[PDB]
């Protein structure tokens, strides 16, 4: 395949990028979620578009399976965005990484434990701040881990709040501010800015 | 500054809990006639890594003395040390020794465990019976009630003599008792049972991970063989013993694994972990070990997981008021100075302010004139 | 909380763990399916159950944040399982790990590329075959991965072979057979070895 | 065993002694408002060297983290980590520190001196006036006193900020500052007063070394630049009020050197030197130095060095007589322990015996039953 | 047995292969004038990393000396060896060194990149003229165009200077320099014109990102106060001049990034990356650095890189014929041992089998016995 | 700066003539069919350190895989990658390799050792016959001879079954068999003579430090349960056939020394140790070890060699600089290419780069003379 690979996070940004995707001339011509397909065409048929799960979208377009892709501050943090260009800050899906605890429950004495699919932002964060942390990798949902005991705190994506205080919960420390960004393959962004460029203008047009 | 990885800062409160608890089981264990040593940290690798597993040496920092271009090394363990003291001091009697120090790991023992723990102990060489290991017992649950914790001990009981004595009289190679050891250390009862059914004597090697909780049957399980082998008797013996010993003397619950097996190479007979609440590494570990033919017996702890366990009486943190103590003169100064001894005798924590704004941390009381008279008033 | 904590994973676990729970006299209170709720109670008042992805469910057992759990071998193998107890093969979920490529497509004759989740279990495989890779760590869907030339091969849970089949995608290697497996913490099954004895004793019962 | 050179056992009475002097001295400064801290032996240099001069870091071993593969030392020097923990939790005010810990030295500073002390110290930051130093040596002191030591503590003082002032006045080089430094440190004055002579303010540096031990006169002899300069006047002040302090409210002699510039890039002013007996090193070493712009004034020991000037009471080592005790019904036996365990509250050591031959060391007296009645008899 | 990630066994004709072009290249370096160094694996850090970057401190394996206790580094870089050899025996003219080595990172620069570089080199130190850049240049390409690749080189001219200038000028503090290098490495252009609309002179900054590619027009554009800048002016016509003399002399496809700011703290000024057709780390880095004033320009490549992209001719293996050998006579062996001596001075690899079965590996062709004559006869 | 111990530069022709050296030894072992591997400088303990001894251990640097928490080594000894080569390519049949890099040791290993030799060697795996060792000793002389030193190799041999054997037959403990060896280390004859009087087949083991020199009535001195001993037998001879092959051959000054039970744990036969004239530490250490898979080689340090070897004069010239600069484009171009032969030739040319610029040990300048370009000596 000569043309652009999109690689596109499902849920929530996939949701909230396929407006900027329709300005740029590039719709899908069936829905995701009803589909068995793993590489879906477009309506330029220089672009197909695959739907990952978001923590694999900086994979895929470092080691070049895509071009170009979409995904989180949040997984680029945690990846690590070294062999990568963030060429753009689409200020979508946006959202805060934050530590969060149990509803006015104390700081123990004792060291704290994190857990957290955050793994190396939370090192990084409790690292600037001074304080020395034991941190437990998580791969799925982490508001039941300071409810049975696992970690003091967790660390985790935060919006409106509601996922935190459902779960007897409350936001405690802001890390940093989260969007997602457009993140493009070294070798793509000279062998294929042709058709890279009209994209890219569009998308920043979009966002204005 | 940031610390290593289980390198942490004991301070304030938590410093003075460590130094009195430190104290405090050290008197004890003096006062039931061990004598304290104090060995140093630091010691050529030849007396201090002496017969050391393979563990021990990867546990322990190596470094250069300068004088004579030979290897150090940082202490992991003490026992090492009690070793040497008791081959030139000890006799061939009865000696009993206690100790308490840092010692310093290369590795965490486990998940997130200390690299620098406060190690206290109580060894006790040349008696063979397990009446010096009652006694052990004895000393450590006295040791442990007299902190007052909420927390509870449990606590698991070995042998390693079982399984030591079935790898001879099976003639098991090196890598097969490698391999049972590996799946005995995560009770893989399915993977064991594949691999004890084409090994000698694997009858009985998957009956000590199925059944060694269950000590008073343990015997009549295994085999016809094993069960002539008085060593095996013995042991399993001792731990009926044992068991019984701390649940009608301490009231303590008791779990038997047979196949715990950690400490393979020094230990030589019976062993103990006493676990606080549901942590997962043992707060206190022990057992039977070799002496330099000398019997010998012993357990250690780290001090500093006590800390988050125990409580002491709120300090009585008094100022004495900056004003009110530089309108005195020369002769009230010198019976203020008096008064604040006393207090300070009594445990009081008494600040004399350098300035108007010297406040000390965690203030509870001040010392204020009033009508020629300094007395105490809460804050 | 007192009595056992059940960590179970969703979806095929959950579903034929129920039955040895129902012998063992542990019945979920409600449908797990149609609830907002993490941990579960039980009509045995010492039983509670908590719901996980089942990546984490070896994180909550070896913490002591569960007792025990119901786990994939697959599972335990790429986490480890060093520090819990594993007691009884169930045999619910039999299922084989295995290599997979392009369908009739062959190796090529560089250096393998291998796209996975199992990335412990493929390094350690591929070095028993005296097999020099390249392993990519995937956390998503990995029949993407040959298809868009991110790695020449996957490694994977397969049962009949037919999601292989529907990506255009076949088996190759026989790596090892996997069930779910019924693990303890170390602690647990030492302190609460009168509560957990009747419900393993069921269990083992139940199975043979 | 042989033990590298500056590292010996503290063994039995020694320990016990070393036990009590660390527990006393330290519930002593705890007392006196400073906080207990207790930092671990190894750290990242990046912290633990931070802004150490040349011999710390000589001084230092270093070993490497298998965690990071970064560089960590033991420590030889417990004040660096005092810095840290004052940075992060002492705030702008004052605050108050001490500390009793193991450092590890690569090298000895004496002949045959130690290179594993039990370093003790406290330390006041973030007051800039002499009375901070005056209240350290009160509480020095009150710990000397509670030691009940026959040995004497002579006390030198001297102050680096005159000579820095002077060179700076002077306009001295650094090859000219480093010729006086040498010899001063090798009382060479032969030499200082021809070098002094192409000096400027050459007699200013002679009459630091053939003078300055006359503190009360000092800077009537010194030119009028130096008598002048505020610094100086303030220095020699200082020296004064210290001098007076010691020697009325303490009883202790005070010698005066302005020459003394060990240490030079890290005192700051004042220094305090504390020797016992006719010992060549000192006991206790002084002074102000900087924190962080944070005022630091502090001391520390080794509290090995006390063991040979200190003493403790004879012990009573008692063996309960195991034929008696073995013949004791239940309710006799708990009547035994009742009043066993009142004499170990008492710091009585008290042996149970496992044999018929369970000898103590050291055994002064045997509990012994007579008339149906426990009593104590001298061996 | 698997090697670590970054770790790769070079083996048999890529060996050979690597053999031949790590000599062949070494000798045209020689050639050139360059001095042939080959300092060593292993050096204390004090030298090893004197005024290293964090990277190059972070890159570098860290290993004790039992000799003394001092910390060594395993290199990872070879140009610090060169410095301090040229400070010993360079002189204060020009000085030409080059050099081949193994050389060790802690983690690898690229996806699947390697750890363990064969780094070939060449430098020159003590000349400030342009000149040396252009003789590095010609020096490369001369070796490049002796490999007969079909690759092709594109070559990458940045200069460091450019940016550090419109920093000073426009007073960036430290925090706007990492956020314009951050967005610079990213290709971020709108949040590139954002930052720059809030900057003084931020217009110059979005300029080298957006115009820096046309070189010859890019003082042009700048601002006034750029403009008059001398350096900002010597770096633009430094950039011309390599620029033409690429083109010109050997016909070199030319990209000009001034946004390039990689080594920010070890470049100087002019720096060159060559890539190899569409790979992501360069073949080939060099620029001006220090000589801690000494001049030093140079460039570096790992030789191991050139393996994939370079091809020797086939190789002829020779196996001789075990039974007809054994059947020669002792003349005929001689004969025969003589043409063999012949057929190795010329590069053919003979096998003189030991057995009937001794089979070397890609096998080529055998010395067979036909009609009383020796020959090659193809398998 | 100052270097550590038994850490050294090798600098300019000396660096040089170690190239040389190391690319034609290397040549030299290709052509004789042996198979050219670069294994790495570092990689896990558990495959670099696999039945590793002590000693191997002990010299090796540890250092941390940040990637995977794993201990990794760098290699002392390039033998064992060898072995792990071997295992994966080399088959059951006969397979010869050849290597050179370098290896890092922690201590020197004897007076003012190296730590940081330049190892060179070469392999024969799968091979019994002592005609793989004759192999090795012809191709090995072969090397030397091609170095044309002046200096001489003296060859010591040794064999460790013979007193492995005699130590399985009195049946020795651990510590009795570590006394022998202290004891044979540094031949400490009345010492031995004590020990061994209180020791099963004693005066066998004094006959070895005593007598084993003198290898031709060495079997008659031992005790008859030894003589009968077959793996005894066959290492005596083992050893006068070698003796004998380096005598006529290669007309080689050969010592026996059947104590020499250094690396007693990795040898499993005939051991060879090369002396260059009186130096403490040998040039050349060789032996039969375990691969069940037969392998014996050799290993030197080639650095060693920079002593007592030399090349020819290299001719160094300089182009004048003002000559060069008043040239025009096209004369500067055949200038070049006169200069690119010159270069072909193996001289080193200096373009320069200021009228001051001056290579070092400078021999030729190339000058311009009536439209001419030649080469005038200095
Ligand atoms: O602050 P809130 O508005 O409650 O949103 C926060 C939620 O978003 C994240 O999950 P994600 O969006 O990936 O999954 P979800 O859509 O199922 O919550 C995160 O793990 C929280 O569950
Ligand atoms: O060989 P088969 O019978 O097709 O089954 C194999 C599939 O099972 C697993 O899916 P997962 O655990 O994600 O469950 P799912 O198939 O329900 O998504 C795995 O990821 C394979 O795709
Ligand atoms: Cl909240
Ligand atoms: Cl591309
Ligand atoms: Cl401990
Ligand atoms: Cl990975
Ligand atoms: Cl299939
Ligand atoms: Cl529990
Ligand atoms: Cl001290
Ligand atoms: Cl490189
Ligand atoms: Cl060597
Ligand atoms: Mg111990
Ligand atoms: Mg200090
Ligand atoms: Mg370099
Ligand atoms: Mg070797």
């Known amino acids: 395949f000569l043309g652009l690979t999109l690689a596109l996070s499902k849920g929530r940004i996939l949701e909230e990028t396929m407006p900027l995707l329709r300005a740029a001339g590039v719709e899908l011509l069936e829905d995701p979620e009803a589909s068995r397909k793993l590489i879906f065409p477009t309506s330029n048929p220089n672009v197909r578009v695959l739907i990952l799960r978001a923590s694999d979208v900086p ?13 989180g501050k949040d997984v680029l943090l945690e990846h690590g965005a070294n062999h990568v260009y963030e060429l753009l800050d689409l200020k979508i899906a946006q959202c805060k990484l934050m530590t969060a605890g149990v509803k006015d429950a104390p700081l123990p004495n004792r060291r704290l434990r994190i857990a957290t699919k955050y793994v190396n932002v939370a090192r990084a964060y409790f690292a600037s701040q001074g304080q020395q942390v034991d941190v437990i990798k998580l791969y799925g949902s982490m508001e039941l881990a300071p409810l049975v005991g696992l970690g003091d705190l967790i660390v985790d994506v935060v919006d409106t709040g509601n996922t935190l205080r459902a779960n007897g919960l409350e936001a405690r420390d802001h890390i940093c501010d989260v969007s997602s960004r457009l993140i493009v393959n ?18 920043k047009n979009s966002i204005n | 500054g940031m610390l290593p990885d289980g390198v942490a800062d004991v301070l304030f409160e938590d410093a003075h809990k460590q130094e009195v608890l430190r104290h405090q089981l050290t008197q004890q264990l003096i006062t039931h006639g061990y004598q304290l040593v104090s060995p140093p940290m630091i010691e050529f690798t030849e007396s201090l890594l002496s017969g050391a597993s393979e563990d021990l040496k990867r546990q322990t920092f190596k470094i250069i003395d300068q004088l004579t271009g030979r290897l150090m090394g940082i202490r992991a363990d003490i026992t090492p040390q009690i070793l040497r003291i008791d081959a030139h001091h000890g006799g061939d009697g009865i000696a009993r020794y206690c100790y308490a120090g840092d010692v310093i790991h290369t590795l965490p023992s486990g998940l997130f465990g200390s690299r620098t723990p406060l190690q206290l102990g109580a060894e006790i060489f040349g008696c063979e019976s397990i009446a010096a290991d009652i006694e052990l017992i004895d000393v450590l649950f006295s040791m442990i009630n007299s902190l007052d914790m909420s927390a509870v001990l449990h606590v698991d009981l070995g042998h390693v003599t079982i399984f030591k004595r079935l790898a001879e009289l099976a003639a098991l190679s090196a890598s097969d008792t490698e391999q049972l050891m590996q799946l005995y250390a995560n009770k893989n ?7 004890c059914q084409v090994l000698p004597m694997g009858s009985d090697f998957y009956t000590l991970a199925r059944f060694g909780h269950d000590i008073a049957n343990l015997l009549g399980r295994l085999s016809e063989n094993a069960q002539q082998d008085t060593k095996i008797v013995t042991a399993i013996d001792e731990l009926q013993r044992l068991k019984a010993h701390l649940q009608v003397q301490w009231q303590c619950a008791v779990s038997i694994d047979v196949t715990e097996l950690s400490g393979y190479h020094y230990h030589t007979g019976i062993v103990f972990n006493g676990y606080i609440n549901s942590e997962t590494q043992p707060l206190v570990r022990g057992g039977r070990f070799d002496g330099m033919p000398r019997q010998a017996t012993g357990f250690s702890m780290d001090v500093s997981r006590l800390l988050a366990h125990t409580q002491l009486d709120a300090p009585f943190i008094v100022l004495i008021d900056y004003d009110a103590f530089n309108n005195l003169d020369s002769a009230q100064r010198q019976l203020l100075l008096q008064q604040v001894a006393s207090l300070r005798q009594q445990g009081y924590r008494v600040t004399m302010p350098l300035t108007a704004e010297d406040m000390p941390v965690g203030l509870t009381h001040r010392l204020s004139l009033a009508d020629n008279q ?5 804050v």
Not at chain 1, 59 to 71: I, L, P, S
Not at chain 2, 374 to 378: G, K, N, S
Request: neutral net charge.
């Open chain 1, 59 to 71: 994979t895929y377009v470092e080691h070049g399976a895509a071009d170009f892709g979409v995904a």
């Open chain 1, 186 to 203: 070294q070798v793509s962004y000279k062998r294929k800015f042709a058709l890279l460029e009209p994209i890219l203008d569009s998308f």
């Open chain 2, 189 to 195: 009862l399915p993977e064991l049972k594949q691999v």
């Open chain 2, 374 to 378: 300094w007395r105490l008033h809460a």
